[PDB]
Amino acid sequence: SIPLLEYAPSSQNQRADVDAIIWAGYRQIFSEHLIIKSNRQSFLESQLRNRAINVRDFIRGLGKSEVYRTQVADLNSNYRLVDITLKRFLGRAAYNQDEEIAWSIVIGSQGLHGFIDALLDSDEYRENFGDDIVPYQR
Amino acid sequence: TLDVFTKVVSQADSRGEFLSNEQLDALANVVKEGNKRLDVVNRITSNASAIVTNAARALFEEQPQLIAPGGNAYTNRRMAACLRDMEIILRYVTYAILAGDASVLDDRCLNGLRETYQALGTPGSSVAVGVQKMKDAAVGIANDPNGITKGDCSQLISEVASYFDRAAAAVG
Amino acid sequence: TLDVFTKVVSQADSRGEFLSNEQLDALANVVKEGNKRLDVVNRITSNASAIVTNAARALFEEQPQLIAPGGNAYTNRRMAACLRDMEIILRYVTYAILAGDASVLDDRCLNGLRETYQALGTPGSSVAVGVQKMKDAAVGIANDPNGITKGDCSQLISEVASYFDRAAAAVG
Amino acid sequence: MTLDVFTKVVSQADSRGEFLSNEQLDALANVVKEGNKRLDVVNRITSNASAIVTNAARALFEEQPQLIAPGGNAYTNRRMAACLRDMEIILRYVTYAILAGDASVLDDRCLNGLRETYQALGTPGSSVAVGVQKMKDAAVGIANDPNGITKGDCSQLISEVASYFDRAAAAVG
Amino acid sequence: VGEGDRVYRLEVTGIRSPGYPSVRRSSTVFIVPYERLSDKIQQVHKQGGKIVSVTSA
Amino acid sequence: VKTPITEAIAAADTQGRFLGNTELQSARGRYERAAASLEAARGLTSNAQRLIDGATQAVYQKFPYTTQTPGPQFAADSRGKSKCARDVGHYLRIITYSLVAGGTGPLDEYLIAGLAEINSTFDLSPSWYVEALKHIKANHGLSGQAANEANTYIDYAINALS
Amino acid sequence: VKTPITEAIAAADTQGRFLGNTELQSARGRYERAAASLEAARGLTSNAQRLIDGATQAVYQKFPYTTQTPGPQFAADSRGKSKCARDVGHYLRIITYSLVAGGTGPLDEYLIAGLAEINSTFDLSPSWYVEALKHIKANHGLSGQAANEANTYIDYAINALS
Amino acid sequence: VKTPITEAIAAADTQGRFLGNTELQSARGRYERAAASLEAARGLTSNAQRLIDGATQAVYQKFPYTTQTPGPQFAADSRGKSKCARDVGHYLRIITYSLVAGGTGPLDEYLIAGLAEINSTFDLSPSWYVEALKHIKANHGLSGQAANEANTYIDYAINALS
Amino acid sequence: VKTPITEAIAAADTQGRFLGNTELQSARGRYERAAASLEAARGLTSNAQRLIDGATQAVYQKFPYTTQTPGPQFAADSRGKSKCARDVGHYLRIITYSLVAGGTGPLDEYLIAGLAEINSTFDLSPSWYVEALKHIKANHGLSGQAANEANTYIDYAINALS
Ligand SMILES: CCC1=C(C)/C(=C/C2=NC(=C\c3[nH]c(/C=C4\NC(=O)[C@H](C)[C@H]4CC)c(C)c3CCC(=O)O)/C(CCC(=O)O)=C2C)NC1=O
Ligand SMILES: CCC1=C(C)/C(=C/C2=NC(=C\c3[nH]c(/C=C4\NC(=O)[C@H](C)[C@H]4CC)c(C)c3CCC(=O)O)/C(CCC(=O)O)=C2C)NC1=O
Ligand SMILES: CCC1=C(C)/C(=C/C2=NC(=C\c3[nH]c(/C=C4\NC(=O)[C@H](C)[C@H]4CC)c(C)c3CCC(=O)O)/C(CCC(=O)O)=C2C)NC1=O
Ligand SMILES: CCC1=C(C)/C(=C/C2=NC(=C\c3[nH]c(/C=C4\NC(=O)[C@H](C)[C@H]4CC)c(C)c3CCC(=O)O)/C(CCC(=O)O)=C2C)NC1=O
Ligand SMILES: CCC1=C(C)/C(=C/C2=NC(=C\c3[nH]c(/C=C4\NC(=O)[C@H](C)[C@H]4CC)c(C)c3CCC(=O)O)/C(CCC(=O)O)=C2C)NC1=O
Ligand SMILES: CCC1=C(C)/C(=C/C2=NC(=C\c3[nH]c(/C=C4\NC(=O)[C@H](C)[C@H]4CC)c(C)c3CCC(=O)O)/C(CCC(=O)O)=C2C)NC1=O
Ligand SMILES: CCC1=C(C)/C(=C/C2=NC(=C\c3[nH]c(/C=C4\NC(=O)[C@H](C)[C@H]4CC)c(C)c3CCC(=O)O)/C(CCC(=O)O)=C2C)NC1=O
Ligand SMILES: CCC1=C(C)/C(=C/C2=NC(=C\c3[nH]c(/C=C4\NC(=O)[C@H](C)[C@H]4CC)c(C)c3CCC(=O)O)/C(CCC(=O)O)=C2C)NC1=O
Ligand SMILES: CCC1=C(C)/C(=C/C2=NC(=C\c3[nH]c(/C=C4\NC(=O)[C@H](C)[C@H]4CC)c(C)c3CCC(=O)O)/C(CCC(=O)O)=C2C)NC1=O
Ligand SMILES: CCC1=C(C)/C(=C/C2=NC(=C\c3[nH]c(/C=C4\NC(=O)[C@H](C)[C@H]4CC)c(C)c3CCC(=O)O)/C(CCC(=O)O)=C2C)NC1=O
Ligand SMILES: CCC1=C(C)/C(=C/C2=NC(=C\c3[nH]c(/C=C4\NC(=O)[C@H](C)[C@H]4CC)c(C)c3CCC(=O)O)/C(CCC(=O)O)=C2C)NC1=O
């Protein structure tokens, strides 16, 4: 509800095909080992092949997936999770330490699911990657 | 996220033995006292919004420079900031009494709390004067018997107040 | 996502009246018949993987060109494709028996499934020959008179089989 | 897209590829001359912006009273806050149109796909334009009243302030 | 990815943006559910494409 | 919409797995409270007309200026008092709706969603409605565990008001 | 990790709201079944050593080649039979763990997570372990509703195997 | 924070380009407007003490029950009346702050941000503060174009209240 | 019996005159008092089993000798404790009677007439029921409105015992 507190941004340097795309989405978020056998979801794979669900929409499911929550959300601290969340979708470590902290309080109020939805909504994130393109390092 | 049921599994996995019979007699008392635990939880959440402002009638009246010009609770967004997360203490303390173990609370609510509270500039010690004022009002509601069958939930009252004392220790 | 409890609310909201006493006597039978739903539901999910391959062999043994070279179940990811969503029929039929109303079934297996099955080129009618073979095995397990206690599950069995017939009608 | 009075007389002048004529500059000189009135007038709409919406909602719902009665699409409370969430967005973009002076910023937001959602959702589309007219009856009543302001004819702005509401009612109904 | 099944199909005509990298194909449908439809129509209009049809599903 | 049977589904659906015993545990648990929750629905439906006019004249007691001040928002003339029993009578409907659903869903979707937006625009102070609901939770005459049951959802509407 | 008390928390935490009666109702259901679930834990813990060697010699019956073929994977060597009672004895631990937790969580996190990766690499056929678990669910000697209780989680490990 | 000089910067910064002549025009506008805006600041600062006690006794007129009803929230005893002149005296500060800034920024960041959250919790009805601000905009005695200048920001706080 | 309706009747009877406006104003004082009182009786009838369990256990903890001393008058045997819940179960009827009647009529006619007459004979100490009613006075759960009217009848019975 309330507008985000203004945080300073540190200067940064950064500032078969179908099957591969699914793997790429999985790879950035799960770092290879996590996909395993259990983490993979049949419905998400079907939607991409089906194309009913957009890639931007596809990632949200992975971000909000139960397997992801147990592995990262539960174990890690809220502040760490905000920093942790940034690498996979944004692809960039947060420039300002204070900014990361500001994000964490918001994450707690809306939950893990709430924070992920917010990242997609932000103008910088959509513009940087695009709906069609899988998230990549910046 | 751990429990009373799951934490007595997790150390029992680390030693790799079957669960003993006196651990199951321990958990049988946890089930037995479960009904009492549920009743206490519902009274806190039903009086959840009434606690926070009644703590804010004393959190700001006792240290009155905080809302006076200059204090960190002065302007209106800043004032709504220490009601947006005065309740998050109650949002996770009630999760701790539900789970029955403070491991849920430690991971999110207090893990990074004492670091932001010197990065922002807010008085960290001026939080734990009023979280104690929440505990004085929380155990007053949870113990009072109104339209309830007589029962003894004293053990919960002391370790309900232990969750507030853990909530005040890692901020101060 | 609707229920038996929530759908008798939703039409009662559209007429804007209080819930009548004979609707509450109807829901009191739903709570009374509630235990039976769980027993039926747990037996299906515990034999969930055993149904699909047993249902599956008949599905391919009766129409044997499908796995023979040329059919749409021929190659190996194509074969794993009609086991990756033979179970999704069981994934949502078990959601329908849990909710007690087929309104959660018709958004996932019945909504756009007949559209993909034409564009894809996979036969649509060759699904509903084997979803009937699932229903022949599902109500055989749910109605088996083994263990628990003898009771009347006939009402549940007939409208458990009604969910499979709705699952076969919108594909064929 | 976003156009103006200043920029639209550029954009057709680019399509013909000629220099701007002197009678177009005499036209724009009247726009600068009549320009000050629009700002003062438009400040009156935004200062009475929240007072218009509920006073339109004292008649948008009182005239068609089944809408908030059980069954109507303005019945429950988030549904009711939904037609105050975007009753003001009409005023949010009509005031952008009077500021720009041309309705080309109005037709991308309130007029573009609005008639498509209003049959996808199930809301009565014609029951919007009964009350956007009730906004226009209150908007030009405030913008014309001369209170503590020097008096000059404001007729050109008022007639075509009401033309923006009529365009806002035509593409919904 | 919508808490409930309330999905409306959207058809945009002509999307102007960086046209090779950002929007490689215009005139395509976007399948957004009920919760973000407020947000989605503001996203389309920022590029400048106009909606044709909005069909539920 | 939010229901313990629904919450078992939407948890297991986002995980793409079947119904485990952990989703299926709740359904068994729900029936036992649903047996005492339907007791609370008949207690409010039968005493419905006593409770509405018991409430809308209790709010006139603590706020006597609401019948005196001439405003569209205030209940000065008969049209406000006609909209008085409509609004307070809408509350006992949704409270009885969330009783038989077992969850706060119908309360969350019909009543309290966007309530801060509407009370700011029409200047309806939320201190009025919380005074009526305190009269309902003390005068429904319900007893036993069913008296606890209506007392949660009334108090849940109280906290969402303030 | 997955528990009906945890599933009430993680549902209510991602919404950012308090514990409603719908999360609280779920907890109530768990207790009725947790009284009969701890009955199933003592039935397996007391008969633990009979059930392991009852199982690891039942799999040798249906698969006699597993004690004969010389391979690292095979249990024909004593070292395999030492790793036989380790592996099957690991199963009864996690089954008893998921009994007292009430959910499939400890079964989901300790046993079946990544089981398709490990059985492909070491060539351990999953038809072996499902044959031992069918021996356990028929020979635990449990009765009543507790006999249903162990029978779900054993069969839940069966479906995750295949 | 929101200022016409700031709004020229944040528009040109997100594009990554220099200050064009279009960014400059917004800044140019402020100087002519800002000459008449500082006229409105001295008109409110010099008449500050007349306007506060002129306002906090005008709200007691239209709402006589606010001095009579005993509650922490109401201004029954002297402690409420001490917090009366604090709160209404806070409004004339931020109105004078947003006058000299030229934008609504200090009004947007100090006063109205999260005002719906605070007035619901402490039950302060926003109809009280809008009655004081109507007294200020009619009794400041300002004339000319400066009388228009204070009249926007007062009315901007009115719309954010309701 | 005594009722402020019949108090107006029996007063006008002895003078032999019609019901003037003197006796008529005593009626509407009884009428609008019932709204508070009727609710005040509903708070006791719903909590019937709570208070007679609460007051009986409060007597034993206050006077620990009354459970141990051998005698018919005491509560050593089972039929004493059976006569314990009968007596305080008989008090709560008349309080609900005298709240509904709106006067001290049923307290006069059914309880306190000859109440000090019997307690000298059966050596029942009146301070037993003083502490019994004082538990009901603190634990009835009704606050304000009818409860204040309701409480007086508890205190009117205490002064009749002493
Ligand atoms: C807005 C604040 C800001 C700054 C300043 C910034 C700088 C920045 N400078 C970079 C590289 C670089 N910067 C230079 C700069 C220089 N070489 C010289 O000899 C000169 C002394 C000097 C410039 C005056 C060079 C040569 C590279 C490329 C180095 C390499 O690739 O090895 C890079 C990595 C590549 C890239 O441009 O993305 C970043 C991010 N980023 C920011 O966000
Ligand atoms: C889930 C557990 C959790 C908690 C509790 C938490 C607190 C927390 N409070 C913060 C700020 C704040 N905290 C407060 C609270 C206070 N300051 C005062 O003046 C009062 C004395 C006191 C309240 C009693 C305020 C007013 C801010 C905003 C300060 C700023 O923006 O600089 C911040 C940094 C910015 C933010 O995102 O909002 C965090 C991370 N974060 C967490 O993840
Ligand atoms: C999740 C929804 C839910 C709730 C809320 C719930 C509460 C609940 N509390 C109960 C009992 C009880 N609850 C209490 C609690 C207390 N007594 C005191 O004097 C203490 C101050 C306080 C604890 C601090 C007591 C003493 C009992 C007696 C019966 C028992 O042991 O369960 C029971 C027993 C069965 C019944 O009352 O019908 C219920 C239902 N059950 C549910 O299904
Ligand atoms: C009779 C034996 C048989 C079966 C079983 C069969 C199934 C089957 N389902 C397919 C596709 C599919 N099936 C689904 C189904 C779903 N996805 C979801 O997320 C929903 C929950 C669910 C419907 C409720 C989808 C989405 C596709 C994508 C491809 C297509 O449109 O066909 C395809 C396309 C070709 C392939 O996969 O190789 C096959 C083979 N084909 C056969 O010959
Ligand atoms: C063959 C036809 C048939 C069926 C289907 C049947 C089921 C059945 N399940 C019962 C009980 C029950 N069934 C369950 C099952 C469960 N509860 C949960 O929460 C779990 C998730 C789930 C197991 C996974 C429970 C808990 C009971 C309680 C009573 C008992 O122990 O039998 C009973 C007891 C008698 C009755 O309900 O009237 C019946 C009849 N009886 C029959 O004659
Ligand atoms: C900026 C251009 C723009 C507009 C206007 C817009 C409107 C819009 N109106 C919506 C719903 C709605 N809008 C209304 C409006 C009304 N109900 C009535 O009876 C009245 C006639 C009317 C209010 C004056 C209602 C009731 C809904 C919700 C209906 C439902 O969900 O069942 C939704 C659905 C989801 C959401 O709001 O987030 C959108 C996206 N979106 C846009 O991008
Ligand atoms: C009731 C019908 C009516 C209207 C609408 C009206 C407006 C109006 N505004 C005027 C002036 C003006 N109006 C403004 C207003 C503003 N300038 C800014 O930059 C600010 C943003 C804004 C105030 C927020 C200004 C600055 C002037 C300059 C002349 C003057 O002081 O009157 C004048 C002076 C005479 C003229 O322009 O011919 C008129 C006529 N007169 C009427 O009879
Ligand atoms: C590899 C497959 C592929 C193609 C081909 C492709 C083409 C392509 N050309 C575009 C635009 C355009 N393409 C043209 C092309 C021409 N106009 C003329 O008059 C000439 C005769 C002609 C060049 C010879 C123009 C003028 C535009 C801009 C249209 C506009 O801005 O409205 C756009 C969108 C606007 C943009 O971002 O620039 C696309 C997607 N995109 C793809 O992904
Ligand atoms: C289904 C659940 C539901 C409820 C309860 C509800 C209430 C509700 N009451 C309203 C107005 C109102 N509400 C009241 C009621 C009161 N004001 C008083 O003076 C009394 C103190 C009090 C009654 C006891 C009145 C008189 C109005 C008209 C106020 C106005 O028009 O400004 C409004 C705004 C205008 C409207 O459509 O009529 C809503 C949305 N809406 C809902 O969707
Ligand atoms: C805590 C839960 C848990 C279990 C149960 C588990 C089993 C497990 N058993 C393994 C191998 C093995 N498993 C067996 C067991 C058998 N093979 C046979 O021939 C018999 C039929 C059968 C026993 C009845 C043997 C003999 C090996 C060694 C095979 C090899 O080294 O290739 C391996 C791979 C290598 C290893 O670390 O030892 C795993 C991961 N791991 C786990 O984390
Ligand atoms: C810097 C901008 C700023 C303002 C203006 C502000 C107001 C403000 N006034 C408050 C209370 C109050 N506000 C008032 C004022 C009034 N009540 C009445 O009865 C009168 C009608 C009215 C004055 C005309 C009173 C009496 C209280 C104390 C109420 C209570 O303690 O419950 C509170 C909550 C408790 C507090 O800290 O004192 C805030 C946050 N806070 C801010 O940060």
Side-chain angles (χ1 to χ4, degrees), chain A residues 43 46-47 50, chain C residues 59-60 72-73 78 81-82 84-86 88 92 108-109 113 116-117 120 122 126:
Chain A
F43 45 97
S46 66
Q47 321 315 351
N50 186 356
Chain C
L59 230 140
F60 303 103
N72 213 355
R78 274 183 167 156
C82 59
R84 81 175 132 81
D85 55 59
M86 202 68 58
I88 301 184
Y92 284 111
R108 287 98 151 88
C109 332
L113 193 62
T116 70
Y117 272 17
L120 217 314
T122 176
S126 274

Side-chain angles (χ1 to χ4, degrees), chain B residues 145-150, chain I residues 47 50 53-55 135:
Chain B
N146 297 333
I148 199 185
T149 68
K150 303 193 172 187
Chain I
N47 263 337
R50 196 182 283 165
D53 246 5
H135 172 85

Side-chain angles (χ1 to χ4, degrees), chain F residues 20-44:
Chain F
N21 202 34
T22 172
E23 289 64 42
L24 279 186
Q25 287 201 347
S26 300
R28 192 297 185 79
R30 219 286 276 192
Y31 300 141
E32 276 69 13
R33 200 162 218 210
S37 173
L38 301 192
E39 183 46 63
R42 312 191 182 193
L44 294 187

Side-chain angles (χ1 to χ4, degrees), chain E residues 15-26:
Chain E
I15 299 180
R16 209 155 311 169
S17 187
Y20 177 61
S22 192
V23 63
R24 195 187 179 169
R25 176 184 302 167
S26 86

Side-chain angles (χ1 to χ4, degrees), chain F:
Chain F
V1 349
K2 198 175 268 293
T3 305
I5 320 196
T6 292
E7 226 27 77
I9 288 171
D13 173 46
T14 197
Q15 299 179 355
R17 68 180 207 88
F18 279 90
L19 291 166
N21 202 34
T22 172
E23 289 64 42
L24 279 186
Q25 287 201 347
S26 300
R28 192 297 185 79
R30 219 286 276 192
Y31 300 141
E32 276 69 13
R33 200 162 218 210
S37 173
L38 301 192
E39 183 46 63
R42 312 191 182 193
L44 294 187
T45 307
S46 306
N47 296 340
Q49 208 43 65
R50 298 172 193 157
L51 266 156
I52 292 169
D53 333 2
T56 182
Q57 276 166 7
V59 57
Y60 295 161
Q61 224 200 359
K62 196 158 166 67
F63 307 96
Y65 76 107
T66 31
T67 73
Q68 307 265 23
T69 337
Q73 69 200 25
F74 291 99
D77 71 275
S78 56
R79 194 196 66 91
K81 304 170 188 177
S82 72
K83 277 197 171 149
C84 277
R86 196 180 56 85
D87 270 353
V88 129
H90 276 314
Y91 270 63
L92 273 182
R93 286 180 55 249
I94 313 297
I95 289 305
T96 32
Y97 286 166
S98 173
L99 277 180
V100 323
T104 62
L107 199 54
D108 228 314
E109 196 194 347
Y110 296 145
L111 191 99
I112 58 177
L115 198 140
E117 215 16 82
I118 195 192
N119 288 15
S120 79
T121 49
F122 290 127
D123 285 59
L124 300 172
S125 114
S127 144
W128 297 335
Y129 293 113
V130 71
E131 223 347 278
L133 294 182
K134 293 185 192 177
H135 175 82
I136 295 182
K137 64 178 274 169
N139 275 24
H140 44 55
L142 216 55
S143 84
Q145 174 47 42
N148 193 296
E149 207 74 82
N151 228 358
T152 69
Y153 292 123
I154 288 174
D155 254 15
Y156 180 76
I158 285 198
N159 300 327
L161 274 168
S162 328

